[PDB]
Amino acid sequence: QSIIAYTMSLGAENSVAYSNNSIAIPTNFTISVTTEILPVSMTKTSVDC
């Protein structure tokens, strides 16, 4: 293992096949849970001059 430098990849390339009479309709689904974190306060502090 070593350190290397390169150009970043904008993501995984993927093309879509457009047409004027083609449609895709899902037949299944999954229920995934995603977390989310937000700060709401800080430690209050008072100082005497």
Partner: protein, 132 residues
């Protein structure tokens, strides 16, 4: 909003179609658990913009027309649920001479099967009445 009700602003309460969330406390913060509904594996089909049957252009009340290459039906936008083409699921609007790319299919109405049973029922009654 995300918790006390259901949200419609896409990608605000969870990545995907949102259902609800369950808040949890934290030291000097708060953490959510968004519950998101996302479609699984798909399948390609043949689609149409409308159907003309007797000179009139037909349109689904909700969803989209769909064909697998042999027959045309109507299903919901986000889940494959085949349904027979019914007029109760398809209103009519004017003639079909302007719909660009229009295709052909017969239009069924759940009115006919009710009439078909009684029409056949009426046929036998008249045949019986010939005996006297």
């Amino acid at each position: 909003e995300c918790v006390l009700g259901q949200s419609k602003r896409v990608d605000f309460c969870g990545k995907g179609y949102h259902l609800m969330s369950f808040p949890q406390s934290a030291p000097h913060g708060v953490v959510f658990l968004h519950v998101t509904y996302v479609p699984a594996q798909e399948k390609n089909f043949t689609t149409a913009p409308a159907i003309c049957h007797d000179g009139k252009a037909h349109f689904p009340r909700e969803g989209v027309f769909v064909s697998n290459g042999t027959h045309w039906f109507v299903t919901q936008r986000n889940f494959y649920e085949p349904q027979i083409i019914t007029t109760d699921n398809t209103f009519v609007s004017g003639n079909c001479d302007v719909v660009i790319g229009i295709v052909n299919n017969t239009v069924y109405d759940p009115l006919q099967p009710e009439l078909d049973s009684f029409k056949e029922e009426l046929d036998k009654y008249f045949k019986n009445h010939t005996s006297p």
